[PDB]
Design a protein around this ligand. Structure first.
Ligand code: DXC
Ligand code: DXC
Length: 83
């Protein structure tokens, strides 16, 4: 399909950046949360401009403990919502 060709068309630079981006994603959660900032940074590494407001919204809509971030259980609900 289209996404498979797209990833195949990535430069080697972009691929090493894409992998770093996931490394940083994982590093973010090592503290038990995923925040807007953490996600902003994964996005930058992917070459995109952060969309902090849209991220906070996605967080806020599942944020039941009022932390302003997502824990593991809130991240699961967030996950089923993107897809
Ligand atoms: C499948 C292509 C490779 C295409 C090719 O053969 O060049 C690669 C290139 C970049 C790869 C992604 C980079 C970030 C992630 C790293 C993780 O550790 C494993 C899953 C992810 C999401 C990767 C999945 C997959 O491995 C991708 C999409
Ligand atoms: C964890 C899964 C899938 C992980 C993956 O395949 O990289 C999903 C659920 C919510 C996803 C994030 C929200 C959208 C974000 C906007 C970008 O347009 C693509 C990457 C980001 C930062 C996403 C990273 C990652 O795609 C997440 C956290």
């Amino acid at each position: 399909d289209i996404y498979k060709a797209a990833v195949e068309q990535l430069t080697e630079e972009q691929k090493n950046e894409f992998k770093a981006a996931f490394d940083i994603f994982v590093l973010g959660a090592e503290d038990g949360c995923i925040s807007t900032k953490e996600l902003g940074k994964v996005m930058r590494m992917l070459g995109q401009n952060p969309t902090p407001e849209e991220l906070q919204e996605m967080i806020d809509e599942v944020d039941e403990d009022g932390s302003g971030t997502v824990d593991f259980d809130e991240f699961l609900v967030m996950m089923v919502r993107c897809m």
